[PDB]
């Protein structure tokens, strides 16, 4: 029957409507503005309580702000300037370095030593 | 068990972090809504293109003033 | 085109996920077991947040604690005691009274009376 | 002229009671005082609650009904 | 003899309500007679909804709401 | 061994029914935030809640013959 | 504006409340997600079969003790 | 002249990179020779993983999501 | 009139580049909590943030012969 | 007995690198002797960092590389 679910799934069941929850609280924030002091705690108070990582919540942010239709309707509700913010919260690692140009081609070459004592 | 421990297929990275001291990166496994954290040093030799492509996507370029 | 949506429609949205942003998380917190004091205050930050009133608030709690599916996942997670603290948090008003039997069919009679001074 | 609880008399009695005037009204018999007045129950109900509870118990009617 | 609504009579007040017989009925007390008999609720709510509406109201109370 | 009626400790929130034992009014009350009901001495409640006792009996009275 | 003053049509009563001193009705109207109070007065008249249906489902029953 | 990784060497290390031509493509320092050359990313992502990895690794820094 | 390099009051994340004008070098710093990049004299780097400018020649040292 | 950094002597600079033992050594000449260690950057650049900023800076290399 449908309510006959193993420790198993159900734990599955629950990671999954954790990170629904999550996921739903974070797009409907971001369509109400950019991200306050006051939404940033209660995230945190959520994600603790909802057990998501921080690299789970940053990449629902990017979710969020890279979604049109959310960045529209906040535009709608609180005009311009509703993503620097969420931007911020969302940071990610990535390679940053300028387009290859001689000017800037640049290394340090060496010639190699022995070893030990010398 | 996590990470590669879980015998699961690498399928995207969807963030990166050092908070820990080290590279780590949040692996989304194939055929799982559960993704775990994961040694760059260890996803760098079982899974490079699934790491290069996380680097390659997310190349972001920044010019010299003058 | 798809994002092309008026001042209205963005309120429409944006209150349909802030209802459903609610509703996540009450069939989240559910899930994991009984209600608590930590998650009560969750809530209530998140209610004022998303602009849920009292009794649309009681009345997802309801629904939650009605929903078989997420009542057997929190006896799978947290056993039983999943629940005395979610029937309390969504009271309602009923009418309350004993079934009709002779010994109990009540009412007072009077004789009514004229006007005025007399 | 005041009237009614106005009048400044101690409760002795509800005589009769009478809702046709849309709302609950009681004729009160006031202590030393032959002449009734007609009070608004929401009046007599906070004024003198005992005197309007022993009204009501002196009706009491329990029913029996077919089957 | 006739009972209930068949006995040409205006509603005054609900008594009471069960569902022993199986549907919900209602012991309603008629204007000028205090031999109060029962209704079906199916038919008080359309012919005197608001009788039936003040019975429910003057008797609700906070409950916890069950699993 | 438990408490009962106003020895629980409960505000009083409605009558919601009445009864004669032994040869003495009672009442059954429904207590605010307790899901069960217990008796009471109408003789109690007549002091300790008036209001309340007063709106049972006001919410259910009829008349021998209806006024106009 | 709220409530009946929207010109809808009442779909459901999903909750009570006499918070504010009298009693209120959160009342669901059709072809609507939004639902607002009103008061119990007005849905009384204006759609008495609503209201009958709210209370009638609510119906709690507690017997006598002994 | 072969060149890139025509000319049979073996990568040692990653200088630099650039889209300019519509495609990825890294400046590559091969080992034994000071004259580095381009390859595309598409061709050093296949031959030479982890130099490529290297290359991006040792860049990485925090920045804010764009809109 | 806007501040520009360490006079920005940031702490240095990384350099991501370096080059040669009027005759001096200068680093392109990424700056921790902040997009914007920026040149600084190197002498200036050496001395404010050793391990940053080390990093920055370590991870991009070369061998004219490669070593066995 | 002690050796590179252990002999508590102050650098003076580095004379060559090499990193073929799996971990980049510096070739280390001290003051007032003419024994040179090699010695791990891991330790030289927190015990002399601007002795290896000095050996960096007299490698700069900046490419010229064909289209």
Known sequence: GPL???????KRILRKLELEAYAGV??????????????????????????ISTERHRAEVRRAVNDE??????????????????????????????????????????????NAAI | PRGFAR?????????????????????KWKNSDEADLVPAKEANVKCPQVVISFYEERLTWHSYPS
């Open chain 1, 4 to 10: 006959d679910l193993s420790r198993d799934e159900c």
């Open chain 1, 26 to 51: 974070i797009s409907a924030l971001r369509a109400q503005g950019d991200l306050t002091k006051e939404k940033k705690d209660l995230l945190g108070e959520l994600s603790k309580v909802l057990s």
């Open chain 1, 69 to 114: 239709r959310l960045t529209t309707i906040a535009h709608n509700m609180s005009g311009p300037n509703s993503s620097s913010e969420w931007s911020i919260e969302g940071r990610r690692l990535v390679p940053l370095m300028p387009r290859l140009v001689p000017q800037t081609a640049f290394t340090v070459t060496a010639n190699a030593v022995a």
């Open chain 2, 7 to 27: 015998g699961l297929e690498p399928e995207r990275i969807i963030g990166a972090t050092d908070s820990s001291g080290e590279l780590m990166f949040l692996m």
